[model samples]
Target: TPHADVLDGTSEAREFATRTGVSGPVLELAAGMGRLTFPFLDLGWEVTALELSTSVLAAFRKRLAEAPADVRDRCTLVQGDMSAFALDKRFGTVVISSGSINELDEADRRGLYASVREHLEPGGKFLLSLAMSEAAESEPLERKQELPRRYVLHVRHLPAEEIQEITTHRRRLLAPDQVVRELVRSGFDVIAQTPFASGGAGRKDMVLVEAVMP
Candidate 1:
């Protein structure tokens, strides 16, 4: 199921680095298969990637093993829960890509935010993206595309009042305000919230939020 460039980062990573001028150690949550993991390294930042899946971690290691010596040396991969990971070091930035936050329940979401906050240096930034329902409905047909690999998908709108089931995981396609509220509650100040094209098989728009630790 692995494809070329699957572990490489995306346009969002470039945008983030450019916007914040953040460099140095970054701790990334839910870093499935090193997608955002390797890109930060390529951009000259050391990265520690945390993922929860065994298979995905193996795939990430495979990709990392193939990287140049410098790139390999700059990366650290850990298998752990995003909500409760403990690392002694603090980071200048923490990132969660691909709307992976949706995979967590409300309690875990709070825990994840607090954990990220605890591990972040003061004024450190937390960068993440969430899929917005507005953008999900912009595309009417299912299609396949390849950039960070290939996958087929379609978007459907659910009642805003209810959470939707993503097969086994319950996903809440959250509104921008809802996300900001949680970020504020978890001791982060919203720095910026911008919408970018998801570039998935579904032409959805993802809102990338950058929050700063006080």
Candidate 2:
């Protein structure tokens, strides 16, 4: 999964830090195995990573052990559910990366937005990416790719967006307007929704909406 160029340690870190601009602290929802977690930690931003997967956290702890002193010191890993998981502390910036919204039902998605608002300091920003639209067709053939550190990644498409059997979660997709509507309803003034990647693997527009709580 780390094979995705967007998840490349250095580049994505730079992009995130650029957008964050030395904020107070950041809370990453569904931070699996320290993908975005480690990067933000590298930038010296205090991070509280919330994740649900126990196995993932085990691996994440192993990764943290291998990380540098500064990163390890600044990071706090929390094993919990994202919806009910809010700290007493507030953050200057909040991030929900890797389509975590896709894992929530419609109500939960909207609730997630409000909960994020509760966690943010005034004028704080939130960045999240989700699948803009489903792919038109399935893979014509099978393929495999390998990355550094003995990472062999296998990606295959299902018949459709119906992975609910394995998990109760469902993807709450949106057109650009639909995304804006939800954000507005949850009391966030939409600032931007930049269009990102187009059709193919990892193909979906990134809806970058920053807002303030009134």
Candidate 3:
């Protein structure tokens, strides 16, 4: 979650609802530090975030405690695996904005897709954004960036010394057509595969692979 702490996800959060024009409840897998969830809560959407890490969840809960009670009320935080979660609930939209999905095998991704299908409402949508392009793929692409020195240092119990050279990574990039094949194999209809034109230079364009199912 050290990477999660430094990563600013507000842009993705701002585009979540607009991506599909669906303002219904959301189920976001691998939600860390309320980076994406907080914005959705602020927009008045009921959100259920599923995260597997206790350390990250603790930090997220602490942050949520500082929010208004109504904001907290709109969010339901759950500790669970995205590949095998059974929430016994449904959401109008489901999203995965992290690279954890790429860390898993094909079988595991199928499981994750199945879990999403189970929780998504009828005719719901799945929008996946990962640090990968449809062009070149990944074997856990490594990225190194310097942290903003003084942020989240106390939360992680580190000296105030600027901890530069923080390395981040993502894995197993899938081809766009292959992802559509997999989605259809999982019984979802492909809606769009538009490139997500990002504002940041050198930021790998994340493919906006959206899906719909009856």
TM-scores of the models, in the order given = 0.76, 0.69, 0.73
Give the per-residue lDDT digits (tens) of candidate 2, residues 64-118: 8998887888888988776666677788877776356666766887778878878
Best by TM-score: 1
Per-residue error for 71 in candidate 3, Å, reads 1.9
Task: Report lDDT (CA) for all predictions.
Answer: 0.76, 0.67, 0.74
How well is each residue in 1-214 modelled by candidate 1, as lDDT tens digits? Answer: 1333364346767766765676577888988987777777888888888999999999999998899999999888988889888888899888886467877778998999989878898778888877667534344445554444566555544322235554345556766557778889888889898776666334546678889877
The best candidate by lDDT is 1
* Better TM-score candidate (1, 3): 1
RMSD to truth, every model:
12.4, 14.2, 14.5
At residue 114, candidate 1 shows an lDDT of 85
Residue pairs in candidate 2 whose N, alpha carbon or C atoms collide under 3 angstroms? none
